[PDB]
Amino acid sequence: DGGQIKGVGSGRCLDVPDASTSDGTQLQLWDCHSGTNQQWAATDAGELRVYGDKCLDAAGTSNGSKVQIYSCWGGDNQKWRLNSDGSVVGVQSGLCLDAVGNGTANGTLIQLYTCSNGSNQRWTRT
């Protein structure tokens, strides 16, 4: 199924730019809508999937590491702990899904960053 993942601080949704299906495409914030590029399904394997067959994927384990779409393979960089406080924590990195530079505008990129309970690190279903 899946649905929107909205950033608390920005009021904008986790969005694959231009509805690309290309592996390595970095995620962004965008005004929320019903496009398939904003529908994320949480799986039992700990994934957040878009298009049914692409995984939310941490390209690295450090602060500033890009968060991208990528073909699913079961790796720990494609697993996310969905905490009750809105944080979305990468299993491999222990870092939070984070809107780059505390940005809120359309096109703000998504990265990993130290969990700090920031509004740019809190994510809600709608």
Curated annotation (Swiss-Prot):
It comes from the Bacteria. Disulfide bonds join C13-C32, C55-C72, C96-C115. Residues 10-126 form the Ricin B-type lectin domain. It is found in: Secreted. Contributes to hydrolyze hemicellulose, the major component of plant cell-walls. XLNA and XLNB seem to act sequentially on the substrate to yield xylobiose and xylose as carbon sources. Belongs to the glycosyl hydrolase 10 (cellulase F) family. This is Endo-1,4-beta-xylanase A. It comes from Streptomyces lividans. The lineage of its organism: Bacteria, Bacillati, Actinomycetota, Actinomycetes, Kitasatosporales.
